[PDB]
Design a binder for this molecule. Structure first.
Ligand SMILES: CC(=O)N[C@H]1[C@H]([C@H](O)[C@H](O)CO)O[C@@](O)(C(=O)O)C[C@@H]1O
Length: 363
């Protein structure tokens, strides 16, 4: 596997990299992103977001800082936890959470986190240049239906999707003040104007749900989400673009995640040549438990053959994760090719998994 972001050799002299993201572009360009965790693995620290771009199918890469933090606090200013999407115009949108003080985004404050915002950039030239940062939360002009009891929110970490009519959907995660406690939930946001403005959906049925992605399936939204301390990824389905949700049994509880906290993973849809819609999930098996997050595996479900049990396809990272921060991953599927980026001992690694997709496609 290629070391895409190397803690021991990078142009920022960063000590650590976390939270990878990948988009396979329609023209075969590969675009990735990662947190630049300059001073170490910590979440609550000084972080920018890098991009790495390749025009030779992953052989070589051009590196840039795609988004800088607000530069207010030399210890705690951070933009992090990328969620991306490619719209039907080819626009590439990146949404990140932004803070500049110590303390977990969801649980530190009982009121709206005052240094918290969601920042968005977009590229109309296939990832070469980015807009200025657009602040989606400083006023009420960009995101409709944000709850009054919001402590904070950000993207689901991974990729969004496009519905049939071109509606853009982003997975998201929110922290809500409820009966003198902070509870966190997954949900989605969507845009009907190519990302300029958004509407927030409503929360999923269980708290302790956070990082997630959704796929589209015949107008429905199906979520696979990190469900902390349950031991598995939860799954929900919405038939009204994220306004209501119910448990989606074929995937709910089917990907096990070991003892302890959950972990981010990715969840994408492919259509094989026989017309079947399949779901692919990347996540650590975490057989050793808690933050070890060993064995980042890729799983497959066939939505047109649901009596067939979820199958482990391969394990792209058959190793223990680093307890300081590891386990995260992101798949991207486009034009019968499949790629993954993932955390690997403080680095980000890259693999082309298209040979495994060919095995599934049976051609
Ligand atoms: C904004 C933020 O803190 N993001 C981080 C989340 C949250 O801390 C948890 O989901 C609890 O909220 O989890 C990580 O620490 C993890 O599990 O490896 C990494 C990620 O960057």
């Amino acid at each position: 596997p290629l070391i895409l972001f190397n803690k021991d050799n990078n142009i920022w002299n960063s000590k650590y990299f976390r939270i990878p993201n990948i988009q396979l572009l329609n023209d075969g360009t590969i675009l990735t992103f990662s947190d630049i965790r300059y001073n170490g693995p910590d979440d609550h620290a000084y972080i920018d977001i890098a991009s790495a771009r390749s025009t030779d199918f992953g052989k070589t890469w051009s590196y840039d800082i795609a988004m800088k933090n607000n530069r207010i606090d030399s210890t705690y200013s951070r933009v992090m936890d990328s969620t991306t999407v490619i719209t039907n115009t080819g626009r590439i949108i990146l949404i990140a959470g932004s803070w500049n003080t110590n303390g977990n985004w969801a649980m530190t404050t009982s009121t709206r986190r005052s240094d918290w915002s969601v920042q968005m950039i977009y590229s109309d030239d296939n990832g070469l240049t980015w807009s200025n940062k657009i602040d989606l939360t400083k006023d009420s002009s960009k995101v409709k239906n944000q709850p009054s009891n919001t402590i904070g929110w950000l993207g689901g970490v991974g990729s969004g999707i496009v519905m049939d009519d071109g509606t853009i959907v982003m997975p998201a995660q929110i922290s809500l003040r409820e009966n003198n406690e902070n509870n966190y939930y997954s949900l989605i946001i969507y845009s009907k104007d190519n990302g300029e403005t958004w509407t927030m959906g409503n929360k999923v049925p269980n708290s302790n749900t956070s990082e997630n992605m959704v796929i589209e399936l015949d107008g429905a939204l199906i979520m696979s989400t990190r469900y902390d301390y349950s031991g598995y990824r939860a799954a929900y389905i919405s038939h009204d673009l994220g306004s209501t949700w119910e448990i989606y049994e074929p995937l709910n509880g089917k990907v096990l995640t070991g003892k302890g906290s959950g972990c981010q993973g990715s969840f994408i849809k492919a259509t094989t040549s026989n017309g079947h819609r399949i779901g692919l999930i990347s996540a650590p098996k975490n057989t050793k438990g808690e933050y070890i997050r060993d064995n980042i595996a890729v799983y497959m479900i066939d939505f047109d053959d649901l009596s067939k049990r979820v199958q482990e396809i391969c394990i792209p990272y058959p190793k223990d994760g680093n307890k300081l921060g590891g386990g995260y991953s992101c798949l991207s599927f486009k034009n019968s090719h499949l790629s993954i980026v993932y955390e690997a001992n403080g680095n980000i690694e890259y693999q082309d998994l298209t040979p495994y997709y060919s095995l599934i496609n049976k051609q």
